[PDB]
Amino acid sequence: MRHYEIVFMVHPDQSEQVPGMIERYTAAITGAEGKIHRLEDWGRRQLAYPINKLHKAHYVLMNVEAPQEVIDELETTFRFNDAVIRSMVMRTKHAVTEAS
Amino acid sequence: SMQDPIADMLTRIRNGQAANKAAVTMPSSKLKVAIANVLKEEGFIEDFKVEGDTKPELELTLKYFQGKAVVESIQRVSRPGLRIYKRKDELPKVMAGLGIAVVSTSKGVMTDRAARQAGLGGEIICYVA
Amino acid sequence: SLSTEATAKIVSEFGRDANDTGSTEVQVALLTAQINHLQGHFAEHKKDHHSRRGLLRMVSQRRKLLDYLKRKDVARYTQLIERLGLRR
């Protein structure tokens, strides 16, 4: 399977939406035997400029190794939420743990 | 891309003299050997050597004494659009008699005097000065 | 490019161990597999023409290779056209 980060922002005052998607996502990726290398949470982080007065991220990444037609379920579910920004899949460059 | 192996043999005679080379190398053939055979016998080259069991390469040996060329003119004459044939008494003189002509004949490659010795005409395939 | 599901899976019918790519007969079946792959690139991205310009070369390479095989050996040509769909 192709390598992908699967990274998404989510505003910290909206963090209740994350267990409402990631607990369904991890079961879909284990159903696809995806490795889920990272599954890491970065506390709270700032953005490079404020966007519609929201300037903060809850910031989580999975690093999945998963099929193109399984990440389509993630792509369409982030697009279904829409209030989540910069939901990116960041292909290739092999697996990552601790990032040096 | 590449059509004439005898034009691609006459290049070698000019290219090597322009670089003052003691020997020059080219792709070999039974016809290019039949011509190198005459180039040695008419005193223009000192020797010829073919090396390669499946892809033979022809090496022609030159000698100098004054830091200058040894053949100042060599010409292919008969070419695919215009071949020139001559009959046993109309055989051509080269540079008012100071050069020689090469004939393919009905037998094999020889000079205009060796052709006039046997009594043969044919295709005029080279001039050499 | 053309998938490995067309360039390795051909050794199921034109062989049993290794491929014979210079045989002319394999090149006709390979150019038919290119046509089936690039007809999958139709009806979408319709302002891109490089696959159609490439197909215009594949269809004539296929006809030339068939004719050249018939000129080499009518038995090896007969051996090919019985294992092609032919005539649509």
């Binding site: 922002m9 953005l47 490079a48 400029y49 991220a57 910069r86 990116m88 990032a99 040096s100 | - | -």
Partner: protein
């Protein structure tokens, strides 16, 4: 370390005007400068940099 997506590494290759620095101070041995100058533009779309300092 060794990657452009960390801001404490990334900030060493850009200026207080948002511009990219000359090769003499990027450590790319003048052989990965082209690729690093594109990785810095990719950091704008990863929410690490603004697209210009004047906005």
């Amino acid at each position: 370390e060794i990657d452009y997506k960390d801001i404490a590494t990334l900030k060493n290759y850009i200026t207080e005007s948002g511009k990219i620095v000359p090769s003499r101070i990027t450590g790319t041995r003048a052989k990965y400068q082209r690729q690093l100058a594109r990785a810095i533009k990719r950091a704008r779309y990863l929410s690490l940099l603004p697209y210009t300092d004047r906005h």
